[PDB]
């Protein structure tokens, strides 16, 4: 008997000698959760679920599904004590965001579950008030077209992390060498993945006795400093918000009083952004303080690293034009071209089904279903729902050429797929 | 030599491929070593069509001799008739620097023994071979804008002639594991000398799960069509590991940790869904399903375990061979 | 840093549009270099130089697709110059675009 | 200081870069393609 602090345990359903104790009169009362307050604290108490720890599981008999594992077949076993709610709840937070994670070679579900942390997106809806360092925020995040039924509980509709993109799987002029991706510069002009990167700066005034105060240094009364012109500094030594700072100009003109020494705090990395907000407070002790948030946009250049939900992190090789990107029979020119050879050895066939499901669910008009073990979405009836709109039911589609206008001898496989722009940028190092 | 080039050399150099008149004027524009003079084509009753082997003869730098065999060439094709003809158009023969026959692949354009890039380092130097790379790095890299080479999901689906037969193996695999459990649970299995009845049980049953893993592996490769785009990246040999697309189509196979199928974790039950005394063909790791059809929520856990034993060794074998080589220097 | 976008179609002070050089490999042939153009202007002149029967090699390439500089190579027969092909191939295209515009304006006035 | 723009042979000038020069990894050769990669 364990009355012990710090174990771990999980809730399962209960079986009573043949069948469940979850009966229809329960879940008709759960369904109206408002104005009946029958919310899981009357379902434990009525003896339908039960917490089971890791070492009574050594004594228990589970079933996967109440459908096939209660109907008598050739009598595998008949002494079921419990059943589980739905067997895709064994995946954690960042491993639930992968559509069809029973279709991935498991090095790639592990790979994505470490890239989900890095892919930027709107993180908390009060970044107007915050003063973080390292605040990335996209312009136009989109909830995904192909989704899991537990994104809703992971809170991934009010706060998404990427933009979809019409993606084609083609070899082309050759800038996609096995981990690379040809973008579309006349889509990047319309804000595609265009994001802001904030920044912050701590500045403790400290009186000690060499003490220092916020001020403006005249050049020929204060000691060593660069040729960082002091135009942007105000009457007291802080930059008012809305003053574009260039690379390496003074933002806080702090002077250790000595004639006086010089302790400017330069804009590092020479990003040339805009100073967006300045607050002035006291510290813990009674000394004046200031935080500064210098923001910069970052258009996706050549270099900035992208990755899907299906492993296979990639770069950005060259940015072509709508002029040059290969058009369909109907004037669609895909935003991103990924290499063919990245499929069969990285081994994600999740990427060829999400790319199929987004083509159904942008013509069926209903945001699709990619729960892990749903057993009702196989790739046969994704196909025959695609075939009821006038496409080819394997997702293929005739592109034309970009430069000549020749019909390509083979087809190309197109379809919208949710891409993430990571934080491994090419302007974090230059 | 990158994958994008080395696959597409197969498609450039069949008998099927003919370049009309304007496309020669581009694939001659992207050479560097070319002497300004257009070759005379093969066919001349329509528009005078140029075969892709004539233009690929123009890259090969001067007189170079070689004979290799493409990776599809049956060994029985070297009988009396059809010796130098070889009706699959395998058997690379480069006489006198001009490609007479044969499809190329990785086996005769990599750096191996007797290779056509190897021979062009032992006859022509190195600055004549660097041009032999930066010609093929353009004229097939920029012919491919007329072919494309996509991968739809139609390129990873078995037709129903074999897909139903590929289960007719595995429905007998799980039968012949029941046949050996109930035979050895009656003291009716003679222990092979060298090991006990335990270790000779496992070797007996890992025999019947690597034949059905391979009888569902040779009938899947042969059943793929001639237009199938996985076959263009395996026959062309540019991307090896032809076992890693036999798991797309047919059967993932066995899982292992420590070289053994999954040990009993809880108490003689590898997961809480099973009975005790389960030495069966699915309660220790073997996977009936393939990635196209999806994976059972048990078998998703077992492939999470086989992918963890091989995901660590990579983190170990960078502190092993990253240390021999900086010590042996 | 990233180049500004207007450098994909402009000639600054110091560039000529075309520089013409000969073919030192094969006689009675020539070579061009259009500055700051792309496949829009390149593929029309390649194609119209193929209808001329006294032209044996009409081709063009762009060296790198990063900056725009078309290279065009022409090989004509004897009894003809290859700077006379590349001048007549343009002046047949301007007779063409003068012929659609007089004909497509009519097909608006029938609506 | 255009008094000191003299240049006679023997001097050492430190230019930025051009094409054609050789840099180290093997030894590449600088061609200039304007972006950040």
């Amino acid at each position: 008997i364990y009355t012990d602090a710090g174990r771990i345990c999980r809730p399962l359903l209960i079986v009573e000698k043949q069948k469940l104790l979850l009966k229809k009169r329960h879940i008709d009362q759960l369904k109206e959760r408002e104005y009946n307050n029958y919310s899981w604290q009357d379902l434990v108490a009525s003896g339908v679920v039960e917490y089971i720890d890791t070492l009574e599981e050594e004594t228990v008999m589970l079933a996967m599904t109440p459908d096939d594992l209660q109907e008598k077949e050739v009598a595998y076993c008949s002494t079921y004590t419990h059943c589980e709610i739905h067997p895709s709840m064994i995946l954690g937070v960042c491993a639930s965001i992968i559509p069809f994670p029973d279709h991935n070679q498991s090095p790639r579900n592990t790979y994505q579950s470490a890239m989900g942390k890095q892919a930027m997106g709107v993180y908390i809806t009060n970044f107007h008030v915050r003063m973080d360092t390292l605040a990335h925020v996209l312009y136009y995040p989109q909830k995904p077209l192909v989704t899991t039924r537990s994104m809703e509980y992971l809170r991934f509709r009010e706060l998404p992390a990427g933009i979809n993109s019409i993606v084609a799987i083609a070899s082309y002029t050759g800038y996609n060498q096995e981990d690379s991706v040809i973008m579309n510069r006349s889509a990047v002009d319309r804000g595609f993945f265009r994001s802001v990167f904030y920044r912050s700066y701590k500045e403790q005034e400290s009186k000690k006795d060499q003490e220092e105060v916020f001020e403006k240094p005249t050049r020929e009364t204060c000691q060593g400093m660069r040729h960082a012109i002091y135009d942007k500094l105000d009457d007291d030594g802080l930059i008012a918000p809305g003053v574009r700072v260039s690379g390496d100009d003074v933002i806080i003109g702090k002077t250790v009083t000595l004639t006086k020494r010089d302790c400017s705090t330069f804009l590092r990395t020479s990003e040339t952004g805009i100073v967006d907000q300045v607050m002035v407070t006291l510290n813990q002790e009674g000394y004046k303080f200031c935080k500064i948030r210098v923001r910069s946009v970052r258009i996706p250049q050549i270099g900035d690293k992208f990755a899907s939900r299906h492993g296979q992190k990639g770069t950005c090789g060259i940015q072509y034009r709508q002029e040059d990107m290969p058009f369909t029979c109907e004037g669609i020119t895909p935003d991103i071209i990924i290499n063919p050879h990245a499929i069969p050895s990285r081994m994600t066939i999740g990427h060829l089904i999400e790319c199929l499901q987004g083509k159904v669910s942008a013509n069926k008009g209903e945001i699709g279903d990619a729960t892990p073990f749903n057993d009702a979405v196989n790739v046969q009836k994704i196909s025959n729902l695609l075939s009821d709109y006038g496409y080819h039911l394997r997702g293929n589609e005739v592109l034309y050429n970009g430069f000549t206008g020749r019909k390509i001898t083979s087809q190309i496989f197109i379809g919208p797929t949710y891409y993430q722009r990571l934080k491994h940028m090419v302007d974090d190092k230059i | 030599i990158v994958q994008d080039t080395l696959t597409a050399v197969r498609k450039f150099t069949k008998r099927d491929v003919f370049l009309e008149r304007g496309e020669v004027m581009n694939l001659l524009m992207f050479l560097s070593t070319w002497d300004g003079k257009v070759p005379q084509p093969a066919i001349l009753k329509p528009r005078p069509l140029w075969t892709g082997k004539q233009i690929f003869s123009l890259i090969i730098p001067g007189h170079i001799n070689c004979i290799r065999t493409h990776s599809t060439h049956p060994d029985d094709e070297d009988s009396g008739p059809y010796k130098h003809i070889s009706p699959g158009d395998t058997k690379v023969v480069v006489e006198n620097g001009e490609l007479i026959m044969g499809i190329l692949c990785k086996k005769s354009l990599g750096t191996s023994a007797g290779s056509l890039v190897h021979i062009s380092y032992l006859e022509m130097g190195h600055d004549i071979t660097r041009l032999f790379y930066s010609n093929i790095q353009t004229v097939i890299n920029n012919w491919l804008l007329i072919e494309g080479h996509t991968i739809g999901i139609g390129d990873s689906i078995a037709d129903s002639k074999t897909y139903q037969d590929i289960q007719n193996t595995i429905k007998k695999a799980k039968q012949d594991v029941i046949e050996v459990i109930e035979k050895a649970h009656n003291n009716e299995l003679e222990p092979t000398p060298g090991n006990t009845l335990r270790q000779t049980f496992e070797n007996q049953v890992n025999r019947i799960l690597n034949d059905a893993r391979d009888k569902t592996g040779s009938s899947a490769q042969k059943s793929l069509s001639e237009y199938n785009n996985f076959k263009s990246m395996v026959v062309s040999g540019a991307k090896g590991s032809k076992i890693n697309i036999s798991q797309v189509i047919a059967v993932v196979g066995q899982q292992n940790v420590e070289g053994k199928r999954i040990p009993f974790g809880f108490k003689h039950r590898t997961l809480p869904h099973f009975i005790k005394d389960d030495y069966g063909p699915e309660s220790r790791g073997f996977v009936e399903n393939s990635y196209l059809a999806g994976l059972t929520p048990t078998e998703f856990f077992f492939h999470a375990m086989g992918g963890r034993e091989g995901l660590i060794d990579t983190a170990v074998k960078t502190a092993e061979t990253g240390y021999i080589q900086r010590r042996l220097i | 840093n990233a180049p500004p976008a207007f450098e994909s179609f402009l000639l600054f002070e110091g560039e000529k549009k075309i520089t013409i050089n000969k073919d030192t490999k094969v006689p009675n042939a020539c070579l061009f270099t259009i500055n700051k153009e792309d496949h829009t202007l390149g593929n029309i002149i390649k194609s119209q130089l193929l209808k001329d029967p006294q032209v044996l090699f009409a081709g063009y390439k762009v060296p790198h697709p990063l900056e725009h500089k078309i290279i065009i190579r022409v090989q004509t027969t004897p009894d003809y110059s290859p700077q006379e092909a590349f001048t007549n191939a343009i002046t047949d295209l301007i007779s063409e675009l003068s012929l659609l515009e007089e004909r497509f304006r009519v097909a608006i006035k029938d609506k | 200081k255009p008094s000191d723009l003299h240049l006679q042979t023997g001097y050492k000038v430190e230019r930025h870069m051009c094409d054609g020069d050789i840099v180290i990894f093997m030894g590449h050769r600088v061609r200039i393609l304007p972006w950040s990669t």
């Binding site: 800038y175 270099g303 090789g317 | 790095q137 | - | 840099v23 050769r29 600088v30 200039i32």
Partner: peptide, 22 residues
């Protein structure tokens, strides 16, 4: 110090150094 990106239009013994680095 920056990224390498693929580019098949350079003769092998070449590198593209951008003008903020050269």
């Amino acid at each position: 110090r920056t990224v390498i990106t693929p580019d098949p239009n350079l003769s092998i013994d070449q590198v593209g150094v951008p003008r903020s680095i050269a």
